């Protein structure tokens, strides 16, 4: 088991055909999960499931540049459940991050930060027990 918040270095940044796999379990009565792909202080891709935003479950995606959040992209398809184990896979493609949860496609997020080789750390936080965080090339 890993301690949350967890920082996974991505040596030399991300590259198309890099696959990041995160395994864990959502805690009971969870409020949030966040994956933050960082370029220094900037957040290239924030993936943020929210379990209770105005009594709705929603996934918020965004980018933070110079300490300012941009336009949110929201997804109402919500594959997570409190108490249950999950697998998140993030596949880096030339023009998008592609996210699958529990082997089902969820969403894609167009690259706003374009210096892919400078996105060199992934922060994982929120109301989860973290089992594994790794990457490979496909
Ligand atoms: O966009 C991701 C960040 O969202 C904010 S919450 C955010 O607040 C603005 C007002 O500034 C609007 O109400 C949005 O509807 C709302 O989603 C979080 O505080 C950050 O941690 C990011 O998750
Ligand atoms: Cl949140
Ligand atoms: Cl970084
Ligand atoms: Cl839930
Ligand atoms: Cl693409
Ligand atoms: Cl950039």
Centroid of ligand 4 to alpha carbon of 125 (angstroms): 17
Centroid of ligand 3 to alpha carbon of 38 (angstroms): 5
Domains of the chain, residue spans: 1-138
Q: Count other Cβ atoms within 10 Å, centred on residue 44.
A: 25
Chain centroid to CA 11: how far? 17
CATH of domain 1-138: 2.60.120.200
Take atom 20 of ligand 1 and give the residue whose Cα is closest: 69
Resolution of the experimental model, in Å, one decimal:
1.5
Centroid of ligand 2 to alpha carbon of 120 (angstroms): 23
Site residues for ligand 1, CB cut-off 6 Å = 46, 48, 60, 62, 69, 72
Q: Are 3 and 121 in contact (CB under 8 A)?
A: no
Using CA atoms, how far residue 114 sits from 21, 63, 92, 138, in Å, is 22, 12, 12, 21
Start-to-end C-alpha separation, the chain:
25
- φ/ψ bin of 131: left (φ > 0), alpha (ψ from -120 to 50), beta (otherwise): alpha
Buried/exposed 107-137: b ≥16 CB within 10 Å, e otherwise = bebebebeebebbbebbbbbbbebeebebee
């Amino acid at each position: 088991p890993l301690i949350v918040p967890y920082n996974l270095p991505l040596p030399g940044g991300v590259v198309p055909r890099m696959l990041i796999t995160i395994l864990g379990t959502v805690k009971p009565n969870a409020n949030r999960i966040a994956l933050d792909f960082q370029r220094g202080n900037d957040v290239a891709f924030h993936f943020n499931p929210r379990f209770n935003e105005n009594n709705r479950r929603v996934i918020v995606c965004n980018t933070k540049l110079d300490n300012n959040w941009g336009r949110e992209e929201r997804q109402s398809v919500f594959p997570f459940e409190s108490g249950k184990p999950f697998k998140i896979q993030v596949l880096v493609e030339p023009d998008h991050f592609k996210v699958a949860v529990n082997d089902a496609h969820l969403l894609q997020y167009n690259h706003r930060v374009k210096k892919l080789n400078e996105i060199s750390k992934l922060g994982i936080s929120g109301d989860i027990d973290l089992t594994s965080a790794s990457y490979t090339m496909i």
